[PDB]
Amino acid sequence: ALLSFERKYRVPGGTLVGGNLFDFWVGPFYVGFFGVATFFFAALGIILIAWSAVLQGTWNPQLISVYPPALEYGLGGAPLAKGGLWQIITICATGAFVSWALREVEICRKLGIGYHIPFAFAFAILAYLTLVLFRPVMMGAWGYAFPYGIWTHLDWVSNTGYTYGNFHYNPAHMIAISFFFTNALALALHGALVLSAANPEKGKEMRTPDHEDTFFRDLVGYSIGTLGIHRLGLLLSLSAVFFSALCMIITGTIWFDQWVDWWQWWVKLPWWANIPGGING
Amino acid sequence: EYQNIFSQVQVRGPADLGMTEDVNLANRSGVGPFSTLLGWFGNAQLGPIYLGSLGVLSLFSGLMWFFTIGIWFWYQAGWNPAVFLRDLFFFSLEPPAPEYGLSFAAPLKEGGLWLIASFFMFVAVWSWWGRTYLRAQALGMGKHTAWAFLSAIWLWMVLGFIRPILMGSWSEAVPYGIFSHLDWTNNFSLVHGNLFYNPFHGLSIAFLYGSALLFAMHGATILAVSRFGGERELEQIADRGTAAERAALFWRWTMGFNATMEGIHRWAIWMAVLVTLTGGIGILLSGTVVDNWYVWGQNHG
Amino acid sequence: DLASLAIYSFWIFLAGLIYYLQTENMREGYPLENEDGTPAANQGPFPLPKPKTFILPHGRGTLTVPGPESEDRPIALARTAVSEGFPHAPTGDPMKDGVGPASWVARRDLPELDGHGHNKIKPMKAAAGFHVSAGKNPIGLPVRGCDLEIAGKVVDIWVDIPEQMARFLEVELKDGSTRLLPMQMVKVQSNRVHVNALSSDLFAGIPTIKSPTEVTLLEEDKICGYVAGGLMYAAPKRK
Ligand code: BCL
Ligand code: BCL
Ligand code: BCL
Ligand SMILES: CC[C@H]1c2cc3[nH]c4c(c3C)C(=O)[C@H](C(=O)OC)c4c3nc(cc4[nH]c(cc(n2)[C@@H]1C)c(C(C)=O)c4C)[C@@H](C)[C@@H]3CCC(=O)OC/C=C(\C)CCC[C@H](C)CCC[C@H](C)CCCC(C)C
Ligand SMILES: COC(C)(C)C/C=C/C(C)=C/C=C/C(C)=C/C=C/C(C)=C/C=C\C=C(C)\C=C\C=C(/C)CC/C=C(\C)CCC=C(C)C
Ligand SMILES: CCCCCCCCCCCC[N+](C)(C)[O-]
Ligand SMILES: CCCCCCCCCCCC[N+](C)(C)[O-]
Ligand SMILES: CCCCCCCCCCCC[N+](C)(C)[O-]
Ligand SMILES: CCCCCCCCCCCC[N+](C)(C)[O-]
Ligand SMILES: CCCCCCCCCCCC[N+](C)(C)[O-]
Ligand SMILES: [Fe+3]
Question: Which superkingdom (chain C)?
């Protein structure tokens, strides 16, 4: 079925591939070529996980875990039972994510809007490929990749982190966290400002953008503006994920020692290295 | 194709002193400069700022917090500016030892200074909370910003005030220092058998994650429909335009359901506040009720 | 124990929150309809919320949502298939008819007002003392279409007074008449403004405003709609 205003937008065209062939809807969902692609890669990927859950002998969602090949296999293939299913599922997952983004591009073209949403999504895809492709390949083994399981993937985060001491000391991790925290601050403020203006004190008229600008200048002496806050959210969230990928691309490649010890570059600088007192002297 | 991440052209007019409503204009400053740099991304106008009683109390109180810590950091550096800058991230104003429990009797050099700094911070944040309520009341706006801010204040209160009290010593609180508060965080996890088994930590992360997912989605969407005046969210609520429609329909056609221009802001405020809300509960229950999240997780009970 | 009670409570609260959040987001577009406009049988498990009423500033009345939905305009479209879920082909020129990516909404035929009740968007010539403060000043630049032909020249910037930003370029055509172009759909270059969305021959077809110093929400939707529709519908003449 259709939203009351929807019919006038359901025109032909916008497709990147297959002309008018897949140019149709199933209920609310637009299909397109990349809809079919997404269904195929997703269905095959779900079958292979169920198969993996057979060879493992558990139908429990909290136990099922597809592990990469052991480190001894390096960057070669591996028996399905020992990390080959992970290898095929990882291809199927990349296929579905990239298909999903190109499907968003088709939806953009039909609606005559900008491509900002699939561009933003590509950053999430980039982070995933860092952990399961770029970092493993740079390190020489699929084994350095994370397993596909609810609790076993958490186990990997913990072991990978603690391999380099307290992972807090990764300076790209520090910057990534700052963007994640600031993003949430900015999302709370944005949600609250628009709602405080649309939903004022009982009996009063809807406020105006002017009230929203006024409120924030009164509070902190600056208002970024209604276009600015939307630019800022996109930038804060994409930055968090950029620095997330960066913090892990440099971990186990250019830096494989304790992250805490990296900070001696600063402490051992010639002009204060030998001065006594403080914590480091 | 132009992307609307930066303005192509800036325009300036007379400085905007803002809406009056029931605000005491006596307490507003005059406009600061215009920043052309800022103006490529957002507004160029700095100021005016409103500074009433609460503003000055908060601002003075908050500087006394910052200065108290810095005095201690200078002392630790033996007053040597080279040592200060070298060890900047290594200095730490630590809370009173467990010996002194919840007493205000500890000496300056063994936690008393921590209690002074903390008192100043306590007054700084709560006065600032009162200010977010009042500045909205004066403009006749909803108190959404005040209620959202309370969610952040909750986690902060729990880490430094509520949990230390229930445990029965100030020694449980967070030290003031860059690297030291990180060690505290890492230590806290180990002592409670790994926060990853704390289900509230799990939700806190989901919401943190989801805040980045949602503002990425939202920001991108509004830029994608800014060619139909999409960023004018309040007038699109009062009188839906093609921007609100194409926005809704992109998401309906992608994932099967959609938002209103107003309703997306309710998704937004809730995704965000639930981070610090679930977070604070997760920490409050740690060492008060649950010694070990691994163990608790094994009984689920 | 106290932690199991807390987590079980939270999951119940979270189910209530998702229910509340979803029904709040059904205040526009609902109920669902079949392609013919009749109400759809299956509406999903979420009911319509109780109406809420916004009081609009400057005596412009109220809005109550949800309320009766109608396009309040004709839709030049026709089915291309005998079952649901296929595209609806334009029955004329989709740019003129305002369908597909050329779609506009019948918004109020009034301009948006600032908080003081003055028109939010004025030409810069009627806004004391607004000036270009940074970046290339587009006023006097020739406007090129995606066919790489000059369609006109910029003769003003229309500015949002309260938010101090450019919103449209006023463009003079061969015939001495003017049109608004959205700021977000042009490229300001050193020696020209470039418009990828439209070819030179489609500039005359841009909907005209009925007063030279104000633009209404209806006129904004018709202009922005038309220009965006160019990306799909002017692709034959793009180079
Ligand atoms: C003991 C553990 C260590 C630690 C070890 C590590 C390790 C190891 C890692 C991190 C990573 C991160 N750490 Mg750390 N980290 C620690 C403590 C912290 C603390 C804290 C307060 O203490 C914080 C806030 C963080 C925060 C962070 C982030 C900066 C980052 C994760 C975000 C990310 O990469 O998203 C990126 C987003 C994605 C990858 C998601 C992509 C989604 C894809 C594209 C789509 C999926 C679709 C789905 C399957 C479809 C579902 C079906 C539908 C629902 C129908 N860490 C401690 C000290 N941390 C990670 C990182 O930076 O990764 C690059 C990382 O590998
Ligand atoms: C980012 C850095 C680390 C990482 C570190 C952590 C830490 C720390 C935590 C998680 C947690 C989660 N992680 Mg993780 N996680 C990583 C990468 C992933 C990837 C991936 C790249 O494919 C996926 C799909 C997940 C998915 C998940 C969820 C099971 C859970 C909540 C996520 C969330 O709310 O996000 C925001 C997204 C939304 C709100 C949208 C909804 C998404 C839904 C809920 C995803 C469900 C996926 C489903 C279970 C997968 C199977 C479906 C297949 C189609 C068959 N993680 C990498 C390796 N992850 C939390 C947890 O509780 O796990 C036990 C948690 O504490
Ligand atoms: C080894 C480290 C441990 C770990 C130990 C802890 C501990 C301990 C805690 C967390 C907490 C969190 N962890 Mg953890 N965490 C781990 C690994 C992770 C990983 C990962 C593996 O990728 C992630 C993504 C996270 C993510 C998170 C967040 C979801 C959560 C903090 C939310 C927040 O916004 O607080 C940031 C927001 C605030 C602190 C609110 C502050 C508000 C106040 C009022 C601001 C005052 C400002 C002041 C006036 C100064 C002014 C400044 C200037 C004017 C600029 N953790 C591992 C297992 N984690 C916190 C939590 O909620 O626990 C459940 C917490 O206490
Ligand atoms: C870059 C900023 C943030 C961001 C942005 C972002 N995400 C997005 C988008 C954007 C802009 C979309 O448009 C798109 C969307 O449609 O959102 C509703 C999306 C999306 N981000 C999603 C999730 C998601 N995003 C995350 C992160 C982020 N996304 C960043 C924080 C995370 C985290 C933090 O973990 C998750 C879980 C989806 C809801 C959606 C993409 C849906 C999609 O691609 O569907 C196609 C695929 C399937 C239907 C499933 C296929 C199954 C596989 C073949 C097998 C399983 C493999 C998998 C690796 C198993 C691992 C499980 C274990 C780890 C538990
Ligand atoms: C350059 O030189 C100058 C002079 C400027 C000095 C330099 C200053 C410097 C270098 C400052 C640096 C400051 C830093 C690094 C601070 C970092 C702070 C961090 C990381 C804080 C982290 C967490 C804080 C928490 C959780 C605090 C919570 C506090 C409370 C909840 C308040 C609790 C109040 C208490 C215990 C007192 C209660 C008493 C009464 C009477 C009610
Ligand atoms: C995040 C706030 C500060 C933003 C400052 C960024 C300045 C970028 C300048 C853009 C260059 C101008 N240009 C060429 C696009 O017109
Ligand atoms: C985000 C921080 C921005 C703070 C900007 C504050 C501007 C204050 C203006 C100072 C001018 C004071 N006075 C009285 C001369 O108008
Ligand atoms: C605004 C609400 C958004 C809903 C998002 C829900 C995400 C579910 C996260 C599952 C976490 C499970 N666990 C193990 C931590 O309890
Ligand atoms: C556990 C979190 C994941 C939940 C994802 C739910 C997706 C909702 C799909 C909506 C489509 C329903 N339909 C076909 C009636 O429109
Ligand atoms: C992570 C939570 C997000 C998913 C919440 C579930 C909402 C499903 C909405 C389906 C409603 C579809 N319908 C018939 C109203 O158009
Ligand atoms: Fe918004």
Answer: Bacteria
A192 touches chain C (CB under 8 A): no
Nearest CA to B229 among C65, C75, A234, C160? Answer: C160
Nearest C-alpha of chain B: how many angstroms from C211? 20
Residues 6+ apart with CB under 8 A from C92: C76
Q: Which of C86, C162, C232 sits opposite A209 (nearest CB)?
A: C162
- Where do the structural domains in chain C lie, given as residue ranges? 2-102, 121-237
Taking contacts as CB-CB distances below 8 angstroms, the residues of chain C near A210 are 114-116, 162
Give me the architecture of the B53-191 domain, per CATH.
Answer: Up-down Bundle (1.20)
Query: Which residue's entry shows tokens 């019919």?
Result: A7
Does residue A92 sit in the same domain as residue A209? Answer: no
Q: What is the DSSP string of B124-174?
A: HHHHHHHHHHHHHHTTT--SHHHHHHHHHHHHHHIIIIIHHHHHT-GGGSP
Using CA atoms, how far apart are residues B239 and C216, in angstroms rounded to an integer? Answer: 12
Is B233 marked within a binding site? yes
Same domain, residue pair A194 and A128: no
Question: Are B263 and C27 inside 8 Å of each other by CB?
Answer: yes
Do A146 and A177 belong together in one domain? no
Q: Give the end-to-end CA distance of chain C in Å, rounded to a whole number.
A: 70
CATH 3.90.50.10 describes domain C121-237: yes
CB B61 within 8 A of CB B120: yes
Which 8-state DSSP code applies to residue C123? E
How far apart are alpha carbons B135 and B137 in whole angstroms? 6
Q: Would you say B300 is a known binding-site residue?
A: no
Among protein residues, the one whose CA lies closest to atom 15 of ligand 10: C44
Strand partners, C123: C158
- From the CA of B270, which ligand is nearest? 8
Q: Indicate the SS3 state at residue C143.
A: strand
Report the run of H or E that residue C47 belongs to, with start and end.
none
- In CATH, what number does C2-102 get? 4.10.540.10
Q: Are residues A109 and A245 in the same domain?
A: no
Q: What is the CATH number of domain B202-284?
A: 1.20.85.10
The resolution in angstroms reads 2.8
Ligand in closest contact with the CA of A26: 9
Question: Domain range holding A191?
Answer: 164-263
Q: Nearest C-alpha of chain B: how many angstroms from C84? A: 15
Ligand 4 centroid from CA C56, angstroms: 39
| Residues of A with Cβ-Cβ distance to B86 under 8 angstroms | 266-267, 269, 272, 275, 278, 280
- Judging contacts by C-beta atoms under 8 Å, the chain C residues touching residue B260 are 24-25, 27-28
Q: Do residues A87 and A224 both lie within one domain?
A: no
Q: What is the DSSP letter of C119?
A: B
Report the domain count for chain A. Answer: 2
Q: Which residues pair with A139 in a beta bridge?
A: none
CA distance C166 to chain A (A): 12
Backbone angles phi, psi at C173, to 5 degrees: -90, 170
Domain edges within chain B:
53-191, 202-284
